[PDB]
Curated annotation (Swiss-Prot):
Changing residue 92 to A: Reduces binding of the preformed binary complex of IL18 and IL18R1 to IL18RAP resulting in impaired IFNG production. The pro-IL-18 precursor is processed by CASP1, CASP4 or CASP5 to yield its mature, active form. The pro-IL-18 precursor features autoinhibitory interactions between the propeptide and the post-cleavage-site region, preventing recognition by the IL18R1 receptor. Processing by CASP1, CASP4 or CASP5 induces conformational changes to generate critical receptor-binding sites. The mature form is then secreted and released in the extracellular milieu by passing through the gasdermin-D (GSDMD) pore. In contrast, cleavage by CASP3 inactivates IL18. Its main location: cytoplasm. This is Interleukin-18. Changing residue 140 to A: Reduces binding of the preformed binary complex of IL18 and IL18R1 to IL18RAP. Pro-inflammatory cytokine primarily involved in epithelial barrier repair, polarized T-helper 1 (Th1) cell and natural killer (NK) cell immune responses. Upon binding to IL18R1 and IL18RAP, forms a signaling ternary complex which activates NF-kappa-B, triggering synthesis of inflammatory mediators. Synergizes with IL12/interleukin-12 to induce IFNG synthesis from T-helper 1 (Th1) cells and natural killer (NK) cells. Keywords: Cytokine, Cytoplasm, Inflammatory response, Secreted. It comes from Homo sapiens (Human). One of its GO terms (cellular component) is extracellular region. Changing residue 98 to A: Reduces binding to IL18R1 and the ability to induce IFNG production. Forms a ternary complex with ligand-binding receptor subunit IL18R1 and signaling receptor subunit IL18RAP at the plasma membrane. Mature IL18 first binds to IL18R1 forming a low affinity binary complex, which then interacts with IL18RAP to form a high affinity ternary complex that signals inside the cell. Interacts with cargo receptor TMED10; the interaction mediates the translocation from the cytoplasm into the ERGIC (endoplasmic reticulum-Golgi intermediate compartment) and thereby secretion.
């Protein structure tokens, strides 16, 4: 069971400190910037009845309703706002925000639906793409900086 607590305006960034943003193809990408309303995200925090940690929802601020989803281990944006309630122990839109042990300032987002899977930055070719993948003990690619303001 998940119950919404609050919401925070956030800018997410990988360790290359490239900002996360949604492009025109509805695809989440990473880039270095010096346009901007596509970088602003809303992180909505939920209370987990099983107490596995801090459950969050990631959605873009300047859209009507687009929430981040990892349905079928594939990153996408559903056409919905974060719900007041989710009545299940797992959700494709729900992630656990976890602070990384030996790094300061850095968070990782574990999928609630698929255990041991994390949001991650991936070089493809000329693009840095947001993907869902499994965790190596370090693995820089699953670490993120989030600026709640």
């Amino acid at each position: 069971y998940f119950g919404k607590l609050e919401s925070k305006l956030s800018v997410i960034r990988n360790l290359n400190d490239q900002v996360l943003f949604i492009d025109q193809g509805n695809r989440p990408l990473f880039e270095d910037m010096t346009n901007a309303p596509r970088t602003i995200f809303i992180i909505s925090m939920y209370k987990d009845s099983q107490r596995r940690g801090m459950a969050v929802t990631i959605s873009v601020a300047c859209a009507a309703a687009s929430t981040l989803s990892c349905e079928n281990k594939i990153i996408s944006f559903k056409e919905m706002n974060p719900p007041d309630n989710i009545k299940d122990t797992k959700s494709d839109i729900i992630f656990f925000q976890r602070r990384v042990p030996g790094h300061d300032n850095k968070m990782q987002f574990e999928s609630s639906s698929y255990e041991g899977y994390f949001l991650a930055c991936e070089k493809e070719r000329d693009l840095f793409k947001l993907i869902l993948k499994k965790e190596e003990l370090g693995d820089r690619s699953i670490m993120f900086t989030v600026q709640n303001e």
